[PDB]
RNA sequence: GGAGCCUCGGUUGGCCUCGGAUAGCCGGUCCCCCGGGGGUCCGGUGCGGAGAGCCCUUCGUCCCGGGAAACGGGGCGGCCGGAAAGGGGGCCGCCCUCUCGCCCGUCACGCACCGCACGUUCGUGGGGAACCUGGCGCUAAACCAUUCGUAGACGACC
């Protein structure tokens, strides 16, 4: 699990091999977040082998599909439940974000945990991504965007293209 | 390992490159910092170390054991014949230091000062400053020197004056004078220049530059003693008698 | 102090990206550094563009903070941004930056000779204004 | 009665960090500062013009003292403006930082 | 996180007449005029309201430590309003045990002389800060009142003489001798 | 063909990196106003960072040891010297194309100065950090001409304001002139608009 | 101030300048106050009184017309301003000079060297030798040897 690129979401279902002892095994659905579907089906076995006694040698993937966003043009407040590991013991977390797709939020969560806690991607176990309303929010860094009349300027502007006219004559204005 | 008992180092590292000086005549490294409050004056002079003797005087430091008594103090005699102003030089304030702007000299220079501009006076034709001596007899030259003066009133900050001694008055063997820049400290630059221009070709006695019961600094060249070992230069302990390769 | 506020319904220009050189209206602000944006009558699909790749203008058009393309278009055409925009000093010196970029070589020669004579009438005229400026001062 | 070439500085050879391959020259042409701007210059014939002591016969002229080394622009180098060139003789190292011309005449316009 | 906005208005009475050139503010009124620079704090200073009754500072996208700079302007600008309509009056009591602190002021309240501190021969000649006018009060023996407008000067000058009269290499609990600040107040009431 | 660079508001390292490349490419550069250069970090940190440089002298003979130049121009010239292969010929041939000065000398005050915004303090710093003026740092290490240059640079300032005031007037007429010859440059202003030059 | 001969080479239109702010600037008007500054008001600000820029633009000519010019185009004498590492910068008279210079249009011509490379510049470049031609000029010093002894191993130094 290398959290490369924008993550996607996959609904992968599997089951044990059919045996004369048990006619048809039950089906197990998951929600995996992976860059490509190949490392999705691998990350699938990692979870099911610790919630069940099943391994890839005694299972079969039944459906490796990608699920798209129901409303990619709506802004949403996503609630993520984590299981990351530090250098000393593992912890449960509840991190909140604000994005357009759940995969857009999960990616954002992976960059943030790496940024705020120096945890690499192989240490984190996303367990629940729930769409919650603006009243059930808890983290203050996202509640501040709940305003029908939000209004804010752009402060002192970090001038880009600072190398295209590399040797100018005028002092570059930063107040737009 | 460490040094057993400490001991202060011999000699000073301040006066470090103990070499034969590159100047026979003492050279003023720093002049007093001027201020327009005081009237114009000189700050330096030039003299010749004659000899030494005693002095009996009445000590007047209240509190001492020697107060209101007689002491004998050793005093040096500095024969100082009056010096002759023969020129002025300007200086501009640069961020790279202090550059010399413009030099003006006198219409007539004594042969004592003209001795200095030659290495062999016997062979030379004594042609120095001749064509400069013929720059005060022409309307195209008198207005030239007026330009050189009226320029120093604008751009010069430090004005030093060029004076030389009078070797004829001395009893010495040599007759070649000693030149010296003497920083005129006083009022503003203009009156520092009018005062200096008027003093041209004139004698300047010590009473113009020093008073009595005053405290001054002496600059000069140490009495040379030649090539000396470590014991004479730095006074380090002579080794014990038993040493093989010298002590 | 600030005059242009990033708020719901401010028209913005676009600096880089595949949508550069177009106008686009801010629907709602998503993140600290990313906003949902939509220019319906400008060949710009509704999407999210970060604040780096946009330069907010001084046009405002009012509508609720999460309406769909149907309502923004009626608010874009009501205030009629396009015609007013192309009449601003900003867009006029934008369409003048491209009129110099596509200037052909023969057009470059027609503008050389045109410039040469307009720098001889102005220069000689200001020379007449100098021989009359010390005249009115002496 | 005018210049007919673009100004280009000969930066260095195609080097690694501890090896340089002198059969290829890195060229820095003025004004071009991106790979997408080098498309115009690919294939253009370049020239390092110098002058020496002895006289050399000149194509269509009198024996002067100037000599050239002809080359060509092979492919775009780096990610900003630079470009590789290949000359009929590997360029002398005393041309580093000196002006070499790139002409226009193999043009694709 | 970065808070989208944090502001703090400052209501001013009518006696004051504030004008501000950019991020520096000048204040004037009866007692004189004041002027402080704030080009080191990176805020928006907006002077709103017709007949200019209130001044507000802003801070967009500021973290914790920048938001701690929002009110310290509002506090700094209020002390300009006090130092223009009411002024500052720092009272100082010279408390001693055996040696009476002989303190005399020179040049109409601009230099402070301190003789016979702990029975010493030294004069702790203290130069005041320009804008401060010191004096010994009448109807009180061991007093030293400081006046002025800028609180950054009347207080700092007080700290000079309060740290000029310090006992060295003794027990500072036994040797309580020295001048100390006793009352921070205004010149006039309202 | 001479890059004249103004050091007012430039960061020391970010500017020296850009200068050193141009100098390596046969470009004669002059970095004027070295005392306006400012290093990042608070002042007491930078002073310590330079005082530790003054302490590295050859123990057996300091006269051969590292020459700690105190003038701001030579400090900036020193850091550029770091980014060049100054042991080789092409390195030493480079450094001769670089000429640094404190203040603005006469051969350059009447020329236009450039600005390198990729090395500009207003650009490359968050507006909460602290920075150390190279002039103040060099003075507190031994540059004994800070007072002189502060008046020589001030002198050429007011001598430039005279020129600027005589330049706005020298073009306020030019704006007023076209309003007085409008009918006879009309045929030359329209062609100067249809090809995007006077719009 | 004239032409040629060696040698070193690199370049191949110029930009003549406010200060400086960057959570702010820039230009005008001056209705305004004190001897230049402040305040004011009107405008500009993804800077167009923009370096994303400006300026100059070069095939040469010859007759004729149109627009623009007359104060212009080119010249010998003086004068001021200039010092941080100082323009061959500008002002006045001058005998001459031109409606030529630039832009629209005509007339015709200039090896049209037969598809092909170092072309086009800064260039009276730097340096060194010899020769031209005139004028205005200018007729020294250093070292040795000698002497000194304020100095000194010898040099050096006085």
């Amino acid at each position: 699990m290398k959290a490369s690129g924008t993550l996607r979401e996959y609904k992968v279902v599997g089951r044990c091999l059919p045996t004369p002892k048990c006619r048809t095994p039950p089906l197990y659905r998951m929600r995996i977040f992976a860059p490509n579907h190949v490392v999705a089906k691998s990350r699938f076995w990692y979870f099911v082998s610790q919630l069940k006694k099943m391994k890839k040698s005694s299972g079969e993937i039944v459906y490796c599909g990608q699920v798209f966003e129901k409303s990619p043009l709506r802004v949403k407040n996503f609630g993520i439940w984590l299981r990351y590991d530090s250098r000393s013991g593992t912890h449960n977390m509840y991190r909140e974000y604000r994005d357009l797709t759940t995969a857009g939020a999960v990616t954002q969560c992976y960059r943030d945990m790496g940024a705020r806690h120096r945890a690499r991607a192989h240490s984190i176990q996303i367990m629940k991504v729930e769409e919650i309303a603006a009243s059930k929010c808890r983290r203050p860094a996202v509640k501040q965007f709940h305003d029908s009349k939000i209004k804010f300027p752009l402060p002192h502007r970090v001038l880009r293209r600072q190398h295209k006219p590399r040797f100018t004559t005028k002092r570059p204005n930063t107040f737009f | 390992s460490h040094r057993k008992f400490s001991a202060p180092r011999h000699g000073s590292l301040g006066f470090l490159p103990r070499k034969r000086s590159s100047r026979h005549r003492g050279k003023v490294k720093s002049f007093p910092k001027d201020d327009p409050s005081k009237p114009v004056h000189l700050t330096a002079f030039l003299g010749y170390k004659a000899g030494m003797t005693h002095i009996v005087r009445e000590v007047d430091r209240p509190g001492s054991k020697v107060n209101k008594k007689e002491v004998v103090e050793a005093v040096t005699i500095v024969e100082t014949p009056p010096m002759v102003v023969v020129g002025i030089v300007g200086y501009v304030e640069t961020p790279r230091g202090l550059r010399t702007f413009k030099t003006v000299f006198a219409e007539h220079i004594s042969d004592e000062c003209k001795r200095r501009f030659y290495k062999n006076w016997h062979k030379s034709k004594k042609k120095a400053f001749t064509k400069y001596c013929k720059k005060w007899q022409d309307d195209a030259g008198k207005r030239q020197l007026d330009k050189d003066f009226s320029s120093m009133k604008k751009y010069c900050q430090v004005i030093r004056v060029l004076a030389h001694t009078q070797m004829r008055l001395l009893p010495l063997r040599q007759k070649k004078a000693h030149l010296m820049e003497i920083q005129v400290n006083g009022g503003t630059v203009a009156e520092k220049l009018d005062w200096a221009r008027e003093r041209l070709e004139q004698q300047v006695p010590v009473s113009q530059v020093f008073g009595q019961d005053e405290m001054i600094d002496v600059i000069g060249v140490t009495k040379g003693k030649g090539y000396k070992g470590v014991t004479s230069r730095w006074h380090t302990k002579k080794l014990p008698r038993k040493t093989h390769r010298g002590l | 102090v600030f005059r242009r506020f990033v708020e719901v319904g401010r028209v913005a220009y676009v600096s880089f990206g595949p949508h550069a050189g177009k106008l686009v209206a801010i629907v709602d602000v998503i993140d600290q550094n990313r906003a949902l944006v939509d220019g319906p009558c400008t060949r710009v699909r509704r999407q999210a563009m970060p604040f780096k790749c946009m330069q907010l203008t001084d046009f405002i058009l009012k509508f609720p903070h999460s309406a769909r393309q149907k309502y923004v278009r009626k608010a874009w055409e009501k205030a009629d941004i396009n015609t007013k925009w192309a009449a601003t000093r900003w867009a006029k010196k934008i369409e003048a930056r491209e009129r110099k970029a596509k200037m052909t070589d023969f057009d470059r020669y027609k503008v050389m000779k045109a410039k040469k004579m307009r720098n001889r009438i102005i220069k000689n005229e200001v020379k007449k204004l100098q021989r009359a400026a010390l005249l009115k001062a002496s | 009665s005018g210049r007919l070439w673009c100004k280009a500085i000969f930066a260095g050879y195609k080097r690694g960090l501890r090896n340089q391959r002198e059969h290829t020259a890195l060229l820095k042409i003025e004004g071009v500062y991106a790979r997408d701007e080098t498309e115009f210059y690919l294939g253009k014939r370049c020239a390092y013009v110098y002058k020496a002591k002895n006289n050399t016969v000149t194509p269509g002229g009198k024996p002067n003292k100037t000599r050239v080394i002809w080359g060509k622009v092979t492919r775009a180098h780096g990610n900003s403006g630079m470009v590789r060139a290949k000359f009929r003789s590997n360029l002398p190292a005393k041309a580093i930082g000196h002006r070499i011309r790139v002409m226009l005449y193999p043009s694709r316009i | 996180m970065k808070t989208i906005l944090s502001n703090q208005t400052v209501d001013i009475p009518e006696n004051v007449d504030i004008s501000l050139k950019g991020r520096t503010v000048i204040v004037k009124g009866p007692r004189g005029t004041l002027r402080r620079d704030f080009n080191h704090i990176n805020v928006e200073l907006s002077l709103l309201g017709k007949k200019k009754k209130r001044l507000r500072v802003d801070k967009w996208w500021g973290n914790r430590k920048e938001l701690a700079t929002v009110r310290t302007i509002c506090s700094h600008v209020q002390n300009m309003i006090k130092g223009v309509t009411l002024g500052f009056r720092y009272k100082m009591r010279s408390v001693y045990a055996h040696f009476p602190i002989n303190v005399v002021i020179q040049e109409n309240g601009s230099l402070v002389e301190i003789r016979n501190f702990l029975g010493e021969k030294y004069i702790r000649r203290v130069r005041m800060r320009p804008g401060v006018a010191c004096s010994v009060s009448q109807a009180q023996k061991d007093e030293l009142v400081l006046e002025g407008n800028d609180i950054e000067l009347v207080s700092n000058s007080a700290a000079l003489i309060q740290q000029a009269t310090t006992v060295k290499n003794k027990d500072i609990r036994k040797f309580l001798d020295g001048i100390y600040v006793s009352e921070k107040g205004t010149v006039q009431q309202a | 063909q001479v890059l004249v660079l103004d050091g007012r508001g430039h960061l020391l390292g970010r500017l020296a990196a850009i200068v050193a490349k141009q100098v390596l490419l046969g470009r004669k550069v002059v970095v004027v106003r070295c005392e306006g250069i400012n290093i990042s970090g608070n002042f007491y940190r930078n002073k310590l960072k330079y005082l530790a440089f003054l302490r590295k002298r050859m123990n057996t003979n300091p006269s051969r040891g590292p020459y700690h130049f105190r003038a701001p121009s030579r400090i900036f010239w020193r850091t550029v010297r770091g980014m060049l292969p100054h042991k080789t010929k092409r390195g030493q041939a480079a450094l001769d194309r670089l000429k640094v000065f404190d203040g603005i000398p006469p051969p350059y005050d009447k020329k236009k100065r450039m600005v390198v915004p990729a090395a500009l303090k207003v650009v490359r710093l968050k507006p909460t950090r602290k920075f150390a003026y190279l002039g103040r740092l060099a003075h507190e290490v031994g540059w004994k001409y800070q007072a002189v240059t502060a008046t020589l640079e001030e002198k050429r300032k007011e001598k430039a304001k005279i020129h600027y005031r005589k330049k706005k007037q020298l073009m306020r007429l030019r704006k007023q002139a076209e309003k007085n010859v409008e009918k006879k440059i009309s045929k030359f202003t329209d062609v100067l608009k249809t090809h995007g030059l006077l719009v």
Side-chain angles (χ1 to χ4, degrees), chain E residues 26-91:
Chain E
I26 68 177
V27 182
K28 68 169 52 197
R31 295 189 60 94
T33 194
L34 272 171
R35 165 191 282 99
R36 205 180 202 270
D37 187 295
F38 292 115
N39 303 154
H40 57 73
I41 206 154
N42 202 1
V43 309
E44 178 194 8
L45 295 175
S46 277
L47 185 56
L48 81 171
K50 186 92 92 193
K51 313 274 170 193
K52 311 325 300 181
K53 283 167 292 191
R54 56 179 193 271
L55 174 52
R56 52 180 252 192
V57 316
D58 293 349
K59 192 63 175 72
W60 314 90
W61 302 108
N63 60 16
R64 176 176 196 81
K65 307 207 67 52
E66 305 160 284
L67 288 209
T69 56
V70 172
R71 171 160 151 80
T72 185
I73 290 172
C74 299
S75 287
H76 266 291
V77 72
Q78 275 166 316
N79 288 93
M80 303 178 73
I81 301 176
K82 284 170 54 170
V84 160
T85 76
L86 294 181
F88 287 89
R89 180 211 301 258
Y90 266 70
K91 290 190 164 185

Side-chain angles (χ1 to χ4, degrees), chain A residues 2-167:
Chain A
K2 193 73 70 73
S4 62
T6 294
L7 281 303
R8 297 166 170 176
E9 188 179 21
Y10 298 96
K11 178 177 80 174
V12 300
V13 303
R15 70 166 191 193
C16 205
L17 267 305
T19 49
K21 85 143 205 161
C22 45
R23 296 275 44 72
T24 289
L27 279 306
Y28 290 150
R29 184 172 65 107
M30 287 211 59
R31 302 159 46 85
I32 316 295
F33 287 96
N36 46 75
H37 79 95
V38 178
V39 309
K41 288 186 286 182
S42 157
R43 178 53 54 159
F44 167 79
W45 291 122
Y46 172 76
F47 290 119
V48 79
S49 90
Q50 300 170 5
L51 313 182
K52 300 292 157 201
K53 295 293 285 287
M54 303 220 176
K55 272 146 69 176
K56 178 161 54 58
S57 309
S58 313
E60 67 195 339
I61 302 299
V62 180
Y63 164 79
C64 170
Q66 185 205 16
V67 53
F68 325 105
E69 173 50 69
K70 283 289 296 302
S71 59
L73 306 188
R74 252 189 51 200
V75 59
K76 287 175 293 317
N77 325 291
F78 287 111
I80 288 171
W81 276 264
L82 288 176
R83 214 192 162 272
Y84 95 107
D85 301 11
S86 50
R87 291 163 187 77
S88 44
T90 76
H91 313 86
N92 319 312
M93 307 193 70
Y94 164 66
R95 208 75 75 88
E96 198 144 347
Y97 294 103
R98 190 172 160 94
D99 255 359
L100 301 178
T101 65
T102 84
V106 165
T107 306
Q108 199 168 269
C109 199
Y110 266 94
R111 269 81 171 98
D112 191 282
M113 291 286 318
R116 288 228 164 82
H117 298 267
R118 263 70 183 203
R120 288 99 179 107
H122 66 79
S123 297
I124 315 177
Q125 296 177 41
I126 169 63
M127 69 190 43
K128 198 181 185 185
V129 172
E130 185 142 40
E131 162 81 12
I132 64 181
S135 89
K136 290 95 175 183
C137 300
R138 283 155 52 191
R139 296 305 174 256
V142 290
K143 296 197 57 53
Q144 75 190 308
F145 291 110
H146 294 147
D147 183 9
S148 43
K149 279 176 293 296
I150 188 172
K151 177 178 69 67
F152 69 101
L154 288 188
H156 167 265
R157 295 280 267 152
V158 46
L159 177 135
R160 267 87 175 188
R161 79 161 301 167
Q162 37 194 299
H163 265 283
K164 305 212 181 333
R166 182 178 259 197
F167 297 94

Side-chain angles (χ1 to χ4, degrees), chain F residues 1-18:
Chain F
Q1 69 270 17
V2 180
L3 262 293
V4 179
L5 273 67
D6 205 288
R8 203 276 318 280
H10 282 58
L11 302 171
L12 178 74
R14 313 304 279 268
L15 175 63
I18 288 171

Side-chain angles (χ1 to χ4, degrees), chain F residues 112-129:
Chain F
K112 173 165 298 308
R113 275 89 69 184
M114 283 316 201
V115 158
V116 186
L120 218 48
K121 187 217 67 57
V122 69
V123 176
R124 314 297 310 174
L125 280 201
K126 288 187 165 68
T128 78
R129 310 294 179 211

Side-chain angles (χ1 to χ4, degrees), chain F residues 102-145:
Chain F
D102 310 305
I104 313 162
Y108 301 112
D109 65 311
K110 292 169 191 168
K111 293 191 179 181
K112 173 165 298 308
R113 275 89 69 184
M114 283 316 201
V115 158
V116 186
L120 218 48
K121 187 217 67 57
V122 69
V123 176
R124 314 297 310 174
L125 280 201
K126 288 187 165 68
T128 78
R129 310 294 179 211
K130 314 170 203 62
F131 46 90
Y133 280 89
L134 197 66
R136 175 195 182 177
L137 166 65
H139 159 260
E140 279 173 66
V141 157
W143 184 44
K144 48 176 71 173
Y145 305 113

